[PDB]
Ligand binder design. Structure first.
Ligand SMILES: Nc1ncnc2c1ncn2[C@@H]1O[C@H](COP(=O)(O)O)[C@@H](O)[C@H]1O
Ligand SMILES: Nc1ncnc2c1ncn2[C@@H]1O[C@H](COP(=O)(O)O)[C@@H](O)[C@H]1O
Ligand SMILES: [Mg+2]
Ligand SMILES: [Mg+2]
Lengths: 418, 418
């Protein structure tokens, strides 16, 4: 039995970033860049107006002037020189004609006569409301770097730089199976004696889908050593990067996941000091030429299964996908109610957290409510839980208002407000 | 010109939740439930062992007993009665045979002889390590309610309850187009005079994809009133729920988005007191029978375009998708450097935030670094920005260490740690 901190260090040290691939612009969204991106031309590539108005010679000052050209885009005003005593109409983003050195916004002008004459109402300064060439992005500047995750603004920067095929780290492909003679499919209606619906598989498929990985659903496997070996061998040779099993890892006489992973590869650990999730097994299998496949023998209890996924599998998926910061967000928060910690193992207590203007202490902060009974068979304890409170193994009652560390397990930008 | 708080109230009051649909179990992930879900049978539906060990009559106490059956799943031990002086082998999740009232874990037992006899080493108590029928979920209990967002544990609860077709609120379908005679596709190589690559469209497509909505990409539209009217009429009749345009909303003589939205429907506002994002237009159009279509005339400047999407379009998508809490997460944080606020409009200053063990004041908390120059044409100011600092319109220099409100715009569970 090892502490969670050691089990995580072992998984981190074994897990390796996947080889990079080339994907299309929209396939790059959510992925980590595997190359730097440099601007092939400046932004703007021409001196551009910041305003709708008139391009002027700043030293002319207020007065009435003829409008000698109009510039909105492309070749508008090409070959025209704005000289002292003239002006040109411009729209925001329009190229500034040669000779003009400032822009006066349309609100500081007045059209005169029934042609093309305008009264400039202010004294402007050279460079006003003009974006010089390369103002926003210089030619050859690095706009994105290796190791940077691609979000909507990074997609915008790739499109600005004319990059439509991108080198990125791919997401791992994950195989998932359930084990047990007591399981039936979730489509089952009336249950026979000693049967339950398989809930872990669909839960894990959804959890892997939220991590943006492809899923290989290998179904229900019975408590038969030869049958489980065949499905594991088929998963290892299929090209997946991670295999997730659940169940078949306790102390029963038909629990074959641990001995099969010891036979096929290297089991680094099979027991972790934590509440819930004690029988977690982690192994590295080499596929026959070749490549490595990581295997997590997740506990069968629905709570322990999801908690082990959230703590151990999520950072592994991220490390394989090239994240330089794969750890989950940990924050400090105040308890809204008393919680008894466990005397033996540190507990990952499920909670519903929210940011409050007053966290109970007079300053704003996160607060947590327990999801109720924490029994590992009670999947209702995971319902709505956006965090796991890290309770040390003291056995004491942590009073309401005391502070604890919490791992945030669901989209902090999708948090329901107080 | 109206404040952002009013513009948001107007959008909220006009935006209506979409009609619910029936989807498959994995299509339900990320969606909001439009019906309550009740358990059709208890969990466990039979008295189940918590441990691998032996089912006993608690009052027998320590001693040597014959093993009369073995129970792991289904019909194992059906018709067998564990009487005083006997025991049954059980695995975790196995049905407890009739007559047995407690389980002694295998670590508190010893197999005796070369058949089927075991020594119970402890005095157990009635009910120990047994999950009674309905312990985790009672028959007919409500396990999920209308208005609840479906995550991995909620998928697990639907599978537990045997629900594979779910009534949910769908995501809106969003049409997106860019406007401008100066734009070229992002595939363009060498740019001609007065041209830039269209960056807003791919940025917005990515931003809508991150919100899990279907995208209708309507391409680049030129600064021609008849051409833009045709594309808007085609978008309105196509069945989309939201139309996003960018550009063509400033003070130029070829900016037709505002007058076209006034002609086609009801424009509620066209100017907002904010930095950046002043020319934001919002309208409601009725499609010819029928249904309503929401239109956002987003500003052309790349920064203003994305900031307006993050503040106004994200909560609208969420409201249409049935979220009861569509507002973004707002937190309080300390500045890592001084920032000058604007004297006229409240600014949405882009920042990179992280949670620190010491936020500078001695207590843990969020801290923020500015992304640098905030000019609305500088898309590099959005790069890596996971928050918008809400700076009031005071014109003062907010010193390093002072506290501000911040809107979190990117997955708080994907935050890079300190
Ligand atoms: N799709 C786009 N991508 C990048 N920049 C744009 C886009 N549309 C408009 N702009 C720029 O945003 C500014 C305002 O545009 P507009 O409101 O059309 O005058 C101008 O500098 C445009 O060149
Ligand atoms: N796929 C599954 N869905 C729901 N419960 C499960 C699943 N697999 C195992 N269990 C339960 O988890 C507990 C531990 O399983 P095991 O480790 O196989 O003994 C038992 O109560 C099982 O019935
Ligand atoms: Mg089992
Ligand atoms: Mg334009």
């Amino acid at each position: 039995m090892i502490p969670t901190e050691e089990a995580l260090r072992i998984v981190f040290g074994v897990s390796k970033r996947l080889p990079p691939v080339i994907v299309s612009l929209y396939e790059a969204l959510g992925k980590v860049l595997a190359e730097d991106i440099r601007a092939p031309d400046p932004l703007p590539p021409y001196p551009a107006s910041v305003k709708d108005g008139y391009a002027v010679v700043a030293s002319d000052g207020p007065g009435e002037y003829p409008v000698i050209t109009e510039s909105r885009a492309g070749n508008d005003g090409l070959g025209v020189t704005v000289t002292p005593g003239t002006v040109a109409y411009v729209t925001t983003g329009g190229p500034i004609p040669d000779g003009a050195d400032a822009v006066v916004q349309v609100e500081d002008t007045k059209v005169i006569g029934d042609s093309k004459r305008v009264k400039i109402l202010i004294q402007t300064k050279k460079g006003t409301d003009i974006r010089r060439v390369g103002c926003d992005i210089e030619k050859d500047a690095t706009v994105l770097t290796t190791g940077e995750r691609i979000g909507a603004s990074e997609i915008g920067l790739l499109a600005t730089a004319g990059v439509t095929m991108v080198k990125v780290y791919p997401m791992p492909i994950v195989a998932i199976l359930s084990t047990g003679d007591e399981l039936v499919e979730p489509t089952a209606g009336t249950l026979g004696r000693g049967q339950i619906r398989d809930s872990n598989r669909a839960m894990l498929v959804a959890a892997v889908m939220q991590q943006q990985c492809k899923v290989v659903d290998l179904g229900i496997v019975r408590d038969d050593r030869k049958e489980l070996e065949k499905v594991l061998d088929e998963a290892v040779s299929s090209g997946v990067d991670i295999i997730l099993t659940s169940g078949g890892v306790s102390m029963g006489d038909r629990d074959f996941v641990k001995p099969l992973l010891e036979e096929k590869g290297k089991v680094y650990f099979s027991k972790v000091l934590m509440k819930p999730g004690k029988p977690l097994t982690f192994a590295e299998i080499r596929a026959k030429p070749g490549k490595t496949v990581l295997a997590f023998g997740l506990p069968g209890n629905p709570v322990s299964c999801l908690v082990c996924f959230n703590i151990f599998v999520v950072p592994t998926i991220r490390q394989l996908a090239g994240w330089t910061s794969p750890h989950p967000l940990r924050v400090r928060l105040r308890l809204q109610e008393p919680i008894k910690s466990d005397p033996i193992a540190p507990e990952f207590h499920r909670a519903i957290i929210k940011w409050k203007d007053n966290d109970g202490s007079g300053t704003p902060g996160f607060v947590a409510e327990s999801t109720g009974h924490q029994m590992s068979s009670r999947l209702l304890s995971m319902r709505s839980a956006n965090a796991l409170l890290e309770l040390p193994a003291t056995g004491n009652v942590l009073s309401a208002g005391s502070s604890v560390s919490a791992i945030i397990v669901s989209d902090i930008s999708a948090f329901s407000i107080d």
